[PDB]
Amino acid sequence: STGSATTTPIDSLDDAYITPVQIGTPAQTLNLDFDTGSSDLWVFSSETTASEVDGQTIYTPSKSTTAKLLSGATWSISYGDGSSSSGDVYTDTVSVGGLTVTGQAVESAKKVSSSFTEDSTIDGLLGLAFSTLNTVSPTQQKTFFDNAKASLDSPVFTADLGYHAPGTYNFGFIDTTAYTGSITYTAVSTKQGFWEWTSTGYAVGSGTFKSTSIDGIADTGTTLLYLPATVVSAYWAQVSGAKSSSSVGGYVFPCSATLPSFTFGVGSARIVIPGDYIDFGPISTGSSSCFGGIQSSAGIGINIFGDVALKAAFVVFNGATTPTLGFASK
């Protein structure tokens, strides 16, 4: 089997991407944030505290003939941005882009933090990291991908995120028309439960490539590119007037600037992030200070190849017995 679903930016900045997911019988379609940096499939629901729901579409398990309470199971998750959610668990039928899993754990939110409430476009998350990070207790649950894997033509999914445009998540096949050149594969460590890999270095604009190992995660659920302070300083030093602002919470730059590209290494291959992808616009409406899309990972504890980086590539998440990550230009 295979699946193929279009993923759409939630706003004009590509802050996140939503993908329609069918849950239950008859289908309830919710728009979920596919997150390769976490491993819970959770939804706004008929159980979510009413004051914490503001415009989201909810899953109502009582209206699904295939929903079953997973008795005694609870979940609670905290994300790197400080947001969180928690609740109980149903099993139900879940379909993504024509690919169906029966008995998927669907984590029903009883509580969500303010950032979720305030984002009316995101009806929940669909985690695609390794199932060892799943938060369901006392019986840990598998991700949608893990459950689907045995039925898939090939044990893979691909992320093809757009810049200010829709893109695609495919399951079970590699669309050879969706990228240019060849795919370069690189080793993954699952030791921390993430799609963790080591970039071979970077360049700023037309500058020389610096060969240096940068361990980080491929994380579709993080907007920006978070890298070591040394690397980030070298990038922003090439932008007149750019500076790190503790008041704003990162690097800012004059909105009048033209940003240089940023290149990262994947083995001997190179992925180029155009400068425009690094512009996240005014820090507040009407400001002439703009927020940068490359930020320091210092104090996160991990480097994160978020959407800024991933959307510059066609990315293969290979979930074979020995997992790997592939990157191609597109």
Side-chain angles (χ1 to χ4, degrees), residues 1-62 64-67 69-109 112-141 143-148 150-190 192-242 244-330:
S1 64
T2 62
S4 181
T6 298
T7 192
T8 302
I10 64 164
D11 62 24
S12 65
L13 297 180
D14 295 347
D15 280 316
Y17 298 78
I18 50 172
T19 309
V21 177
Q22 282 70 49
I23 309 175
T25 309
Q28 300 181 38
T29 299
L30 274 66
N31 296 327
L32 306 187
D33 183 353
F34 284 22
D35 182 12
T36 63
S38 69
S39 305
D40 288 49
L41 192 176
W42 73 260
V43 297
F44 279 78
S45 75
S46 57
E47 301 180 329
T48 309
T49 301
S51 62
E52 295 180 349
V53 183
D54 188 7
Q56 295 80 11
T57 294
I58 63 165
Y59 168 59
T60 303
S62 65
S64 173
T65 61
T66 43
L69 182 72
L70 186 63
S71 183
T74 58
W75 62 280
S76 181
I77 193 163
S78 297
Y79 297 100
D81 69 350
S83 67
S84 64
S85 53
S86 64
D88 56 16
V89 187
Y90 293 82
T91 55
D92 209 338
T93 302
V94 173
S95 300
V96 176
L99 171 66
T100 300
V101 167
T102 57
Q104 175 64 46
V106 177
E107 302 172 34
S108 169
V112 304
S113 64
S114 59
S115 62
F116 289 115
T117 299
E118 292 162 2
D119 190 354
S120 67
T121 70
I122 291 174
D123 302 324
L125 266 66
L126 189 149
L128 292 167
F130 293 88
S131 293
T132 53
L133 293 180
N134 176 267
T135 77
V136 177
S137 180
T139 307
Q140 189 172 58
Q141 302 293 305
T143 70
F144 175 82
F145 178 53
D146 217 328
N147 282 324
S151 306
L152 294 178
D153 292 356
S154 182
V156 304
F157 67 91
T158 65
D160 181 9
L161 303 179
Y163 169 64
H164 295 170
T168 305
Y169 283 101
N170 290 332
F171 293 83
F173 72 106
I174 289 163
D175 180 356
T176 59
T177 72
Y179 60 88
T180 59
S182 58
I183 306 176
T184 298
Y185 290 87
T186 195
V188 166
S189 173
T190 63
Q192 298 192 100
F194 299 119
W195 292 92
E196 187 171 2
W197 64 289
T198 302
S199 172
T200 49
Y202 70 100
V204 175
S206 59
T208 61
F209 187 84
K210 177 71 168 181
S211 291
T212 185
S213 293
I214 304 169
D215 294 341
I217 67 167
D219 185 2
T220 59
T222 290
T223 313
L224 307 184
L225 174 53
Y226 295 88
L227 291 173
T230 47
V231 177
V232 176
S233 183
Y235 177 82
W236 289 108
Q238 298 305 310
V239 179
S240 178
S244 182
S245 166
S246 51
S247 57
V248 174
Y251 281 90
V252 296
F253 67 93
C255 294
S256 62
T258 300
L259 297 178
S261 64
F262 184 89
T263 300
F264 63 95
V266 182
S268 58
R270 306 289 180 255
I271 299 296
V272 179
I273 305 172
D276 292 344
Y277 290 25
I278 299 161
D279 174 21
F280 278 75
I283 61 172
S284 294
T285 304
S287 180
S288 68
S289 183
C290 275
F291 197 68
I294 296 178
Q295 296 293 344
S296 178
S297 64
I300 295 178
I302 198 154
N303 301 305
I304 307 173
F305 293 86
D307 297 335
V308 163
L310 302 180
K311 75 186 170 199
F314 177 86
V315 186
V316 180
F317 294 79
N318 170 30
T321 305
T322 299
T324 65
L325 269 174
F327 292 81
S329 294
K330 67 187 183 190

